[PDB]
Each structure stands twice: as C-alpha cells, then as structure tokens.
Design a protein around this ligand. Structure first.
Ligand SMILES: Nc1ncnc2c1ncn2[C@@H]1O[C@H](COP(=O)(O)OP(=O)(O)OP(=O)(O)O)[C@@H](O)[C@H]1O
Ligand SMILES: Nc1ncnc2c1ncn2[C@@H]1O[C@H](COP(=O)(O)OP(=O)(O)OP(=O)(O)O)[C@@H](O)[C@H]1O
Lengths: 120, 420, 113, 180, 434
C-alpha cells in the first residue's frame, strides 16, 4: 500500500513511538495502551541498551535534546509534535482527556502493516 | 521603520523576541502569534509596555474576559477596527457597515473585505495587529474555535493594503499543545523565581505605600522630624521582604497573592510604629510579631444552635460515616478522611431518638430545626433543581466537617470519639 | 452561570436607566447615554444557595469595571450562619478582594435579650 | 541467600530439537572421572587465591548497578566474592583476577537472566531487526567513515579501530559491499 | 546599519514572500510541483476539466505550491483563470454557498473592470464570453457534515458537464481521504491523489537550508560574505551550526518547524559585524530550545515553594499507595502532618519546624491545581466544538458542589519522576520514595 511508502519516511521519533507502542501491545495482549505506559516503555527500551557512547548520545538527543546544560525533561523532545502528527494523519486515534496519563492511544491501521513498514 | 525594544526586567528574551514577529513591514510579520505564560507572569504587562514604547504601531486591544463568548469577540474586532481606521485616516471619505450584523466568522471576512476595499487607494500596505489578552481565558471555549482564527488571513484578498496580523496570549499548556503541529511562532513566559518576586514588589509597591494616608497621620502623631522619603521607602520595603519571607511558603511565588496581604496588614503594621520603631525594624518586628504569626486572610460558639438542633446534627454525622451494618450492633440493647455517604431520613430520626437524653418523639420543632439546617446548608440533599423535600428519591448527607462537630459534642457532653 | 448573570444584571440596569427621564459596554456607555454617574449596589439575597463557582467567576468579571472612572460598585451579602461558610467555598484569591473594604453587621432579632 | 539461581527453560523449536535429539540418539549405540576428581582434589589442595586491588574496585560498580535496578540484597554480594575465588581456583591462579570477577558477575546475570527480565514487573521475554539496531549501526557507520579518514592515513588496522571507538565488523563489511 | 536592507531581504526570503520570479522550489518538491504545474495549465490552456487532491501533513508546504503556480499564471494569464477559495473551518456549510457567490462576483467585476446557483456560474461566464474556474479547497475531509456534500458533490459532477472548464484542488492531511469522500462523491471525482514527498535525507534538509539561506541578488556587497560564511558552516558535517540541524533532522523532519527557530536568530541579529560571531557557534537556538520547554511539567515543578513541594510529595505518596491513584485534601494533610512529626521526632530534645494550620494550606492547595500538577478525578477537559461546550457550561458536575476538602484529584507526576528531578539538596528528597 502507498501508506507504507510514507511510513518508511517518518522521523526517528515516529518510528520509535510506533515500535514501542507495538511492543507494549504484544506485552499487554491488547491494542490500546495508556499514554503514560508508552512514554515509560520508551525510556525502558532506550536504557535497556548498553552505556555505549552512541546510546548515550541518542538518549541525550531524545530526552533532554542534548542541550548544553538546561535539561531534565520528563518526556522526550517533540513527544507532542509527533504524537499530533500521527494523530492528525488519521493513523493514530486518541481520546480526549486533560489528564495526560490516563488516556488510551489506539491505532487505526492494520496490525500487520505497521510491523511491515518497521521491518523495511 | 525599525522597532525599539523596551527595558522590561525578568523578561529580557520575550521583549527581544517580539522584535521578530512585530515590525513595520507587513510582508515579513506572520499571520498568527502566541504568547504563553501563567497568571502573574506579566504577559499583559509586558505586551502593553512594549507597544507604548513604539507609538508608530497600530493595534487593537480586546479582552475575552469581558467579551464573555465568541460572538462579542468577533463583533468587537469589527467595531473597533472600523473606529480605529477612522481615527488613523479621518481624511478618507468612507461609509459604515453595522458591526452588530456579525453572526458567523464568514460575515467577518465579508465585512472586513468590504471595509478594506474602501481603503484600496492607500499609499502602502498597512500592517495591523489585533491583540487579545488571555485567549484561553474565554469563559465558553472549545478546541475548534482557535483554528478558526489561525487560517483567517489567507481568506482575505492577498493584495489588500490592510493586513490583519493577529496576536494572542495563552495561559494554559494542555490547551496550546493541541496546536503544536501548526508550528505557530511562539514566545514563552515561565513562572517567576522567588528572587524576582521580591524585587518586583519592591520596585512596584514602594511608591504606593510611601504616600498613603495612614502613615502620614501617624508620623505627625509620633512627631518624627528626622523622617525622609528615602527612609520612607525602606520602611515600606522592609515590610515587603518580611511578609514575603513569612508567607512565601503560604502564597507561593505569586505576585497577586502578596499584593493583598501588603494591603490588609499594612494599617495594623502602621499602628505599632512608635517613636522607638523609626530606626530599628527588629524592634518594630517585635512589636508587630502577632501580625506575621497568622495569615489574617481569614474573613474574621461558631454556630448558634438550639438543643434540638445540636443533637440533630450529631446524629446525622453518624449516618454519613457509619455503615448501616453497625446501626443495630451499637445502638440497640440486643474513614475520617473519606467523603460522607448518603442516608435516608428514617435513619436520622431513629438515631436522633436513640441518643437524645422518656422518648423525645418528633414534634413540629424537631422538623422545624431540621429544615433550618438544610436552609443553613449544614446538610445537603441529592438535587439541584426544583427542590421537593417529600419526593421519596431524595437522600441526605452531612456537609459539616469533623472538627466543627468535635466542639459541638463538647458543649453537649456527648462522647462521639468512643463510637469509632 | 456567568453568562446569565451579566445579561440579567444589565437588563435590570437598563430598565432603571430607562426611567431616568446587555453587557459591560452598557456600563462603559452609561455616562454618554444618560449623562450621569452610575453607582451599583448588588444585593446577594441568599448567599448560601448560590453556586460559588459561578459567583467566584462573576465577582472577578465585575472587577474589570474599575477601569471606568464613572462607575462605583457595592456588594451586600445575606449570610445566615457565619463567615466560615464563605471562607471555605470561595477561592482564597477572591476573598482578598472582599476583605479590602468590608463592614460586618448582625441583624438577627435575638440580640442579648 | 542462595548464591546462584538458574532459570533453565525449554522452548518448542524444531531446529533446537534436532540439535538435542541427534546428540542423544547416537550416544546409546554399540576427560575421565579419574582425571576430573584428580584435578578438583589438586585445586582444592593448593590454591588459596587473594582478591587483588583492581578486582576489588570493580565489584562496587557491579553491585551498585544491580542495586539501582530494584531485590539486590547484600546476600548477592557474597556471591560476588565466593564465585570470584572459585574461578581463580579453577584457573589455579593464586590470586583472583579481574577477569574472574567480571565473568562471575556475568554468570550471575546469565543465571538469573537479567537481560531478559522486565525491570518493571519482573516478567521474562519469550524471544530472549530493530530500529534501535538501525540507528546504532547508522551512527557507528557514520563515525567509522570519519575516523578511518580523520587519521593521517587512507586506512588503518581494524583491531586498532575497534579499540578506538569501543572505548563493527558487520558495519565495515557493509561499507566494503558499498565500496566505501 | 545599512546591512538591515540585506537582513530584510533575508527575513523576507525566509518568510516565502519573495516575488514569483524569485520563489524557490526544493529539489525534493520539484517532482510534484511539475505535475501540479502540468495539470493546471492543461486545464486552463487546453480547457479540460480535472480534479486532484494534494495530500501531506500540516506545515508541509502543501497549499504553498498552489499559490506558487497561480502567482506565476497571474504574470502572463490574467484573463485565463478564475479562482475560488474555501476552508472547512471558517466557512461552515451554511455560509459556504455565499462564500463562492461573493468571491465569484468580485472576480467577475474586476475582469471586466438551488441547483441553478451552481449552473449560474457557467451562465454568467457564457453570457460574458459570447476562462477555466480553478477551485481550490483547504481541509477537504472537513466538509463531511450531516448535510449532503453537494457543496463538493455538485462540483465534481460539473467536471462531466462544464461548458466552461472546471478544475478542483484541495488540501487534507488524512491518509484516509476516501473514507470522507463517500461513494456518491467518489463516482464523480477523478481520484488523482498526490501524496506529498517527504524529507528523508540530511542532504535534502541541508540543501533546502541552502535554498533558503542563499542570497542570489546583489543587493549589498556583503552578499558574497554572507554566502561565504554560510557555506563555511555547511561544508563541515561537524559544524557548530550544522550540529543543530542534524539533531533537528533526526528528531523531526518538518522543515517549517525548523524555520520557526532560525528566523529569531536572524531577527535577533543586530549588525553584520556581530552577526559573524553568533551564526557560527549558534548558541541562541539552545536558549530558544529551553524556551519551548520552560512551561512543561519540569519547568513548573522547579518554581514551587518548599511547602507547596512538601504537600505535593505527600499528595503523591497517597496516590502511590492508593490503587486508583486518587487522593484528597484530608489525606494530603494527614501525610503532611505525619511527615512533619517524623522529621521533628528525629531530633535531640531539650535539657531545661512548624506544622502549618489546615486553613493556611488552602492557598497552597489552590496553587497546585492551577499549575496542573493535580487534576480532577474525571476531568474531561477542553471540548472540541462550541455546541459540546454549551452542554458543559450548563451542566453542574459533582465536583462543583462537594466541599473543597473532599474533591478527588489525580497526579501528573509520578514519585519516580519527582526523585529524578527534585534536587538532592532538598530536605524532603529523602521522602520522595515511600
Ligand atoms: N517584569 C515585571 N516588572 C514589574 N512588574 C511586573 C513584571 N511582570 C509582571 N509584573 C506585574 O505583575 C502583574 C501580573 O498581572 P498581569 O497584567 O500579567 O495579568 P495576566 O497574567 O495577564 O492576567 P490573567 O491571569 O487574569 O489572565 C502585572 O500587572 C505587573 O504589575
Ligand atoms: N503566500 C505565502 N507566502 C509565503 N509563505 C507562505 C505562503 N503561504 C504559505 N506559506 C508558508 O507555508 C508555511 C505554513 O504551512 P502551509 O501554509 O504550507 O500549510 P498548509 O498547506 O496550509 O497545510 P494544511 O495541510 O494544514 O492545510 C509557512 O512556512 C509559510 O511561510
């Protein structure tokens, strides 16, 4: 499908978000996942790797932007921008609550094609 | 023309950032702009201060706080711009369109296009900024409303001389994040630090109380010949530093909250000033010790109730916090932090009869006192519209906290504390 | 709600002003419309039953009137039990507005025999 | 208080079944124990290794790393020396080496399967190509293309290159396939 | 001082407001731009009815291309095209009909110096010609209201029967556009969906940056010095200024969002002499970067007072112990009371720290709800539409009536994040855990 051609060109943030969401789906045995659980599993998967300098640089760029001194964000940079981008493209369906960490994130696309795009 | 930047302190990034999106060239400035910061962060003060330093600009000030819903907001834009163009360009012969005819956002575009055509003969394109202070502070607000203002400029004829360069300010963060993908040029205000709050009120409120009526009466009464206005400022300044250190953990890092305690306690602080308090604030603090030990933000035998009234309330709290399971176990001769549960009226009367000091029975006075408590709002019901007490589906609950009832039982000599 | 409060208050204000000889713009336009200063006294006839969330917002709404120089406002509170009920439900930011200029009065029939 | 806990799991894999099956099926057709006992008795008799200064300090970081991931009581710190001595005794080295220390720590990690265990709820991964593998390979390849040419030579030994960046073969092989 | 003229040129170029003779199209966009250019000219010059949708994310230079081609056609074909603009947000289905008619009348008047309403567009043209109508739309999917899509269903029908050629374009970010365009409208639409190209290499981004930052007009002699210094910071992949872009590239690949930070750097620039010192190291995007993050959860947490933090920590402790994660004022104070007792108890006594009163904590409690650390048990939050918000403004929930000390809240920050952020110099750090 032509959707995969757009999936394969997403930024690294989108790919990591989708992969973490799929892994949480396979762990939970359910499709929708709590939004806080997703950002917790992102940290889990980032830090499960070794303390190699490449991993350290990637993590610093992702979570605290890799800035000079100003740091300590609770969630990764552009975590809202890419969430909306997936949401506004119709791929990602989310319900509306002003409480961040109790809303459920749900997928519209088929279960298989997301992995297929990620496997490419 | 280039724009001169003001000297506002503790905001020396935003006062420089607005030099980007606000300029005399309408071909550069963006069509949407957002200033985001919480209450007491100075967004209204900073924006107004910048504009008053560049008189060559043209802008319209509106407040959604007064403009309760979106319909007034649209109408005010149409009405004020119509007046503002006349004020700027009185020489141009122009006609009028009724600003009360605005019913939908399309009509605004219709009216604005009609107005802007009348100014087609202008020498140059005119950059105009529309300012709304506290956009998200609108009383009746929805997500789709803000998108209606973002894409408004491109529906105008792009060759029009008049360009509407909207300006908005937002308080919250869960509201702005829904529009992150639009990448609207945004300039940010964070909360003020403790040090800045102390300095802000020193610079702002010093001159206010140096010239109040209360002190200059007392100074003559105390016959302070050596007093000087330089001393007058520091005398008032010491009050701000002390009250901040006393109540920073109480009020927070807030300017609005502190600006009122500096008012209430001030006359009382003035009274304790004597001939011996001119030079040593430590002694003055000692005299006024009791002022700081209490917030005095409180508005001020707390509830005058009859004997029948007192037992009525005591019985109800048992109903609202004791399980129906325990009614027979405790009273028949055969959770402090939770919200109270509901109960039936028959449960109240039975317990009231059970603990009243042979039977008390239920005369008119007992029900007369019970209804008054509902009128006095010490007991709540399960309804909000067309209150009908005798409707069987309505239930009752206690609206009185534990601490008040504690003192009620003391005057009654009823030992409630042993029932839990 | 706050929307109802602003409209009804202005509706009564205009009706009284109509006998001289619906929003805050009427307050601004009052001196130009009728050539006289306006002094408004609000009578909260029964404070206890009033939704404090609505009332708290409305009081702040009226606070914008201080920009005008020809308008003066007074508030009367019918309190049944004590000041303690007000001090709980109202937001503590709002209470600091009332305390700046207030007078405390008792009107109960029973007073020291 | 147990020093080592081993989680031996059997998975239904056709490939691994043949590996085990053909081992046993041909064994019942048709070092000796004497040497093995002679070795063990010799090792217990002579070697009494002493932990060196270098081996000591690494234990602190090894234990703290498990400590911050918490059930890492001080009982498991006994295993961090008891196993260290037993490894040197097998080595017959009369002191405990840092290599013994790290291998024993790995053995504890492998016995308990920490890498395959959820740090949140303690569950175990069934499986134990990923995007994180991609980026690490991409970032590694990007730096190799610089270091290989940043030095004042057109190329260098891969052994020195690995120690220069690890402080890899697949990444450079792909570059060779692309003739870089 | 005079450099501002070149700075104005840079600022104007960054904003895309250059004249059509100077408008720049990126290489990764040129492929779709030529397809768009072909269809428009074929529909105008060859008088053929056609219909196409442009598809891509927001801030993707999508409607920008439609402006570019029309801005070029105006330079040589003033008499050939008629443009109609509609938008799904501002122009509701009630006001959509008059939107076309008013705009159509404006174009018709300046050229010369209710099914029949759709036909009257051709009737007005045919009566005055004895000019292809270029429909352009934003948010195509949004017109899927309960009212029939005759607003669009008739326009695609006109493709079959237009005596004066009718061409239709539109913008939409959904990848599921055909779900919104129902079967009855589908039968008339040519279905030439054009998904916009994506930025997929750093070479694409840097060249696009080169496209924006190049100055190809000899306005001032320092133009060469600009291009010299510009390519200095893009020739080395490890450049200080390029360092931000690669990090920008890997995080998010929408180009205009990157422009949002560069323009302040260009705008904050004061003079060419000082400009050289700043543009190379580029330390002013870091300050901007934290500015974007100043009012997040971490930013709000850092500005609280000790008492506000202490109650917050105790509030979190109740939430962690509670299975539902909820808490109230009474439980928050009780843990605050107990933790003060514990701290006081661990102190030598006297040989012959204040617990704040329950009243004074109320202001402290109000601050935490304003700053979004707490939230109500079932806080729906902002509604999507005014009609939905109308019900919310009228309905009175339970929380608006229950006492101030018993309104159930929940937490946005977990104690683990507290321990990750709270300075260890804080006295209540030891109470961050259970
Ligand atoms: N840099 C500063 N220097 C001096 N005073 C300042 C500064 N910043 C803010 N203030 C003061 O703080 C006050 C904060 O009120 P402000 O006008 O900002 O309200 P607001 O945040 O727009 O209002 P609302 O919360 O009702 O939407 C200002 O009125 C001003 O007196
Ligand atoms: N007439 C114009 N002149 C200059 N720049 C423009 C013009 N119109 C749009 N832009 C540029 O477009 C960018 C904003 O995104 P854009 O307008 O391309 O999105 P869009 O096509 O409206 O998006 P959506 O898919 O949400 O409808 C900005 O960087 C702005 O400079």
């Amino acid at each position: 499908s032509h959707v995969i051609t757009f999936m394969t060109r997403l930024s690294f943030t989108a790919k990591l978000f989708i992969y973490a969401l799929l892994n949480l789906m396979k762990k939970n045995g359910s499709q929708e996942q709590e939004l806080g659980d997703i950002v917790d599993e992102i940290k889990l998967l980032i830090e499960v790797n070794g303390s190699n300098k490449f991993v350290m640089e990637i993590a610093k760029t992702l979570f605290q932007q890799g800035s000079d001194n100003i740091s300590e964000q609770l969630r990764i940079i552009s975590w809202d921008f890419v969430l909306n981008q997936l949401l506004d493209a119709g791929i990602l369906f989310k319900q509306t609550m002003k409480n961040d960490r109790i809303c459920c994130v749900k997928l519209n696309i088929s279960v298989e094609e997301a992995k297929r795009a990620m496997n490419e | 023309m280039n724009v001169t930047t003001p000297e506002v302190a503790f905001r020396e990034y935003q006062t420089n950032c607005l030099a980007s999106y606000i300029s005399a060239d309408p071909d550069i400035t963006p069509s949407n702009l957002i200033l985001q910061g919480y209450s007491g962060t100075g967004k209204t003060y900073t924006l107004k201060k910048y504009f008053n330093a560049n008189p060559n600009l043209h802008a319209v000030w509106l407040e959604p706080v007064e403009l309760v819903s979106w319909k007034p907001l649209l109408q005010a834009i149409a009405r004020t711009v119509q007046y503002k163009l006349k004020t700027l360009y009185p020489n141009i012969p122009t006609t009028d369109y009724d600003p009360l005819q605005v019913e939908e956002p399309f009509l605004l575009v219709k009216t604005l296009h009609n107005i802007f055509v009348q100014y087609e003969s202008l020498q140059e394109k005119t950059c105009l900024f529309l300012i709304l202070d506290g956009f998200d502070s609108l009383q009746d607000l929805d997500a789709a409303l803000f998108n209606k203002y973002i894409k408004l400029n491109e529906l105008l004829p792009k060759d029009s001389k008049i360009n509407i360069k909207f300006i908005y300010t937002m308080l919250e963060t869960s509201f702005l994040q829904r529009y992150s993908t639009h990448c609207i040029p945004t300039v940010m205000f964070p909360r003020y630090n403790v040090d800045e709050v102390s300095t802000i009120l020193v610079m702002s409120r010093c001159g206010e109380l140096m010239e109040d009526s209360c002190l200059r009466k007392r100074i003559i009464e105390e016959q302070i010949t050596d007093c000087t206005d330089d001393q007058f400022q520091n005398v008032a300044a010491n009050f701000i530093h002390l009250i901040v250190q006393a109540f920073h953990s109480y009020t927070g890092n807030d300017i609005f909250a502190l600006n009122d305690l500096i008012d209430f306690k001030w006359p009382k602080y003035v009274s304790r000033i004597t001939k011996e308090n001119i030079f040593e604030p430590l002694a003055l603090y000692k005299s006024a010790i009791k002022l700081f030990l209490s917030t005095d933000d409180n508005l001020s035998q707390t509830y005058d109730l009859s004997i029948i009234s007192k037992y009525l309330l005591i019985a109800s709290y048992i109903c609202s916090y004791l399980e129906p399971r325990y009614d027979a176990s405790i009273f028949s001769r055969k959770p402090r932090y939770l919200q109270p549960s509901l109960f039936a009226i028959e449960r109240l009367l039975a317990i009231f009869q059970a603990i009243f000091p042979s039977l008390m029975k239920a005369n008119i006075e007992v029900f007369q006192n019970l209804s008054e408590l509902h009128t006095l709002k010490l007991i709540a019901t399960t309804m909000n519209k067309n209150i009908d007490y005798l409707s069987p589906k309505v239930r009752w609950k206690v609206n009185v906290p534990w601490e008040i009832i504690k003192e009620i039982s003391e005057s009654v000599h009823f030992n409630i504390s042993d029932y839990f | 709600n706050v929307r109802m409060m602003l409209r009804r208050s202005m509706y009564k204000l205009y009706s009284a002003a109509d006998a001289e000889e619906y929003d805050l713009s009427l307050v601004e336009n009052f001196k130009r419309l009728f050539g006289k200063d306006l002094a408004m006294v609000f009578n909260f006839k029964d404070v206890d039953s009033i939704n404090f969330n609505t009332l708290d917002n409305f009081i702040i709404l009226l606070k914008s009137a201080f920009k005008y120089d020809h308008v003066k406002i007074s508030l009367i509170f019918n309190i049944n039990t004590n000041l303690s009920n007000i001090e709980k439900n109202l937001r503590q930011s709002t209470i600091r507005l009332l305390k700046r200029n207030y007078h405390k009065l008792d009107v109960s029939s029973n007073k020291g025999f | 208080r147990f020093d080592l806990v081993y989680l031996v799991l059997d998975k239904v894999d056709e490939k691994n079944d043949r590996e085990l099956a053909k081992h046993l099926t041909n064994l019942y057709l048709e070092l000796p124990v004497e040497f093995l006992t002679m070795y063990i008795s010799y090792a217990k008799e002579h070697i009494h290794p002493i932990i060196t200064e270098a081996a000591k300090t690494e234990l602190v970081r090894a234990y703290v790393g498990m400590r911050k991931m918490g059930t890492a009581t001080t009982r498991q710190l006994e295993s961090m020396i008891r196993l260290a001595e037993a490894h040197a005794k097998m080595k017959l080295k009369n002191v405990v080496e840092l290599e013994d220390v790290q291998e024993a720590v790995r053995l504890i990690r492998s016995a308990i399967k920490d890498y395959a265990t959820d740090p949140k709820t303690g569950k175990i991964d069934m499986n134990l190509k990923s995007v994180i593998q991609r980026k690490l390979q991409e970032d590694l390849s990007r730096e190799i293309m610089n270091v290989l040419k940043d030095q004042a030579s057109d190329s260098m030994s891969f052994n020195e290159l690995i120690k220069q960046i690890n402080e890899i073969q697949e990444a450079l092989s792909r570059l060779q396939q692309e003739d870089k | 001082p005079g450099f501002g003229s070149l700075q104005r040129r840079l600022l104007q170029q960054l904003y895309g407001t250059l004249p059509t003779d100077e408008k720049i199209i990126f290489t990764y966009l040129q492929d779709c731009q030529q397809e768009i250019d072909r269809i428009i000219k074929q529909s105008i010059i060859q008088k053929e009815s056609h219909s196409v949708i442009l598809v891509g994310p927001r801030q993707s230079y999508k409607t920008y291309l439609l402006d570019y081609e029309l801005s070029l056609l105006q330079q040589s074909y003033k008499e050939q095209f008629i443009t109609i603009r509609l938008n799904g947000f501002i122009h509701s289905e009630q006001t959509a009909i008059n939107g076309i008619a008013t705009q159509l009348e404006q174009q018709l008047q300046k050229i010369h110096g209710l099914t029949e309403v759709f036909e009257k567009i051709l009737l007005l043209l045919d009566s005055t010609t004895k000019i292809t109508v270029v429909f352009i739309f934003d948010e195509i999917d949004t017109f899927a209201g309960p009212v029939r899509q005759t607003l669009l269903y008739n326009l695609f029908d006109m493709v079959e029967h237009s005596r004066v050629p009718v061409c239709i374009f539109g913008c939409t970010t959904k990848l599921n556009i055909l779900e919104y365009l129902e079967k009855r409208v589908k039968s008339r639409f040519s279905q030439r969906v054009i998904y916009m190209p994506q930025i997929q290499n750093l070479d694409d981004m840097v060249d696009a940056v080169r496209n924006l930052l190049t100055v190809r007009s000899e306005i001032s002699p320092w133009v060469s010095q600009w291009n010299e210094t510009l390519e200095k910071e893009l020739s080395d992949p490890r450049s200080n200024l390029n360092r931000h872009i690669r990090m920008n590239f890997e995080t998010f690949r929408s180009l205009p969002t990157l422009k949002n930070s560069i323009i302040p750097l260009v705008a904050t620039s004061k003079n060419f002499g000082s400009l050289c010192t700043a543009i190379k190291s580029c330390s002013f995007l870091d300050i901007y970067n934290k500015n974007q993050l100043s009012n997040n959860l971490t930013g709000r947490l850092q500005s609280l007072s000790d008492l506000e933090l202490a109650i917050l920590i105790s509030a979190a402790r109740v939430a962690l112990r509670a299975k539902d994660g909820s808490f109230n004022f009474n439980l928050a104070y009780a843990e605050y009371e107990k933790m003060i007792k514990a701290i006081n108890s661990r102190i030598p006594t006297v040989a012959p720290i204040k617990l704040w009163l329950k009243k004074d904590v109320k202001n402290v409690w109000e601050n935490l709800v304003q700053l979004d650390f707490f939230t109500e048990k079932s806080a729906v939050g902002l509604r999507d539409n005014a009609t939905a918000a109308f019900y919310a403004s009228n309905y009175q929930f339970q929380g608006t009536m229950i006492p101030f000390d018993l309104r159930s809240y929940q937490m946005q920050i977990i104690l683990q994040e507290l321990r990750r952020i709270i300075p260890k110099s804080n006295m209540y750090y030891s109470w961050t855990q259970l």
